């Protein structure tokens, strides 16, 4: 079924990255991300008919393979200090179902952020170092920046936006704990207001931008939720949502 390399490993500036994933729990369609902040799910790898493995938003510097729609597996030779992550299998069908993400991988090349609090937070010394292609891929997805953390689990509201002209839904989720990520629910814009389970979605028009209600929350950095769109097909448009928070009091 649905499962990633369950082997366990780090790697080191350019030093090797074993991954493999199978495909057999009655999805139609196999999706590839990464946890990777900044835009929180990193889409690199897409599978859904055999033979395709290679269409997330920046594949370069991995190497996957997909000899048979129910067997996979990729891997890479030369990682950069800021580019490794969690590699998250994710496999469902089509309409409205949960990714069901399986046993991922999560490796990490060079890095420790220990002790830097006295230092400059930019290594002029080779590795990379901006170069050709400093900004480009546009954005729709828009969910307001900055996240916060409330006292205890109390409520808290979200904000989306958009610049598709031929959106159907957005099925709001990502992850709550920190590596098992899950659908929550599916709106659609359509009736201005909506409720599944126990929080509300709104539409403002004068903005132009979705925003929703959650009430009843539980600590343990509280949940992150993400706001992409799906009226395409075989194609999801997420803009890092947001990582709400519980104060540590």
């Known amino acids: 079924a649905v499962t990633q390399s369950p082997r366990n490993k780090v790697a080191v500036t350019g030093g090797k990255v074993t991954l493999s994933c199978n495909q057999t729990?009655?999805?139609?369609?196999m999706y590839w991300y990464r946890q990777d902040t900044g835009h929180g799910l990193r889409l690199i790898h897409y599978?859904?008919?055999?033979?395709?493995?290679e269409k997330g938003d920046i594949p370069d510097g991995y190497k996957a393979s997909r000899p048979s729609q129910e067997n996979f597996s990729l891997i890479l030779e030369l990682a950069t200090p800021s580019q490794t992550s969690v590699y998250f299998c994710?496999?469902?069908?089509?309409?409205?179902?949960?990714?069901?993400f399986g046993p991922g991988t999560r490796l990490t090349v060079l890095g420790s952020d220990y002790k830097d609090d006295d230092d400059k937070r930019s290594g002029g010394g080779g590795s990379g170092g901006g170069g050709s292609g400093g900004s480009g891929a546009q954005q729709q997805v828009r969910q307001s920046p900055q996240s916060l953390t409330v006292w205890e689990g109390e409520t808290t509201i979200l904000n989306c936006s958009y610049e598709?002209?031929?959106?159907?839904?957005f099925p709001w989720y990502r992850q709550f704990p920190g590596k098992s990520p899950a659908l929550l629910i599916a709106?659609?814009?359509?009736?201005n207001k909506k409720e599944d389970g126990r929080f509300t979605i709104f539409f403002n028009k004068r903005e132009k931008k979705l925003s929703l209600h959650i009430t009843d929350s539980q600590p343990g950095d509280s949940a992150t939720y993400f706001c992409?769109?799906?009226?395409?097909?075989?194609?999801?448009?997420f803009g890092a949502g947001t990582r709400l928070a519980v104060s540590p009091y």
């Open positions: 992409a769109a799906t009226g395409s097909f075989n194609k999801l448009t």
């Open positions: 729990n009655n999805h139609n369609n």
């Open positions: 994710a496999s469902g069908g089509q309409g409205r179902a949960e990714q069901f």
């Open positions: 598709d002209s031929t959106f159907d839904y």
């Open positions: 599978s859904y008919g055999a033979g395709s493995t």
């Open positions: 709106i659609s814009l359509v009736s």
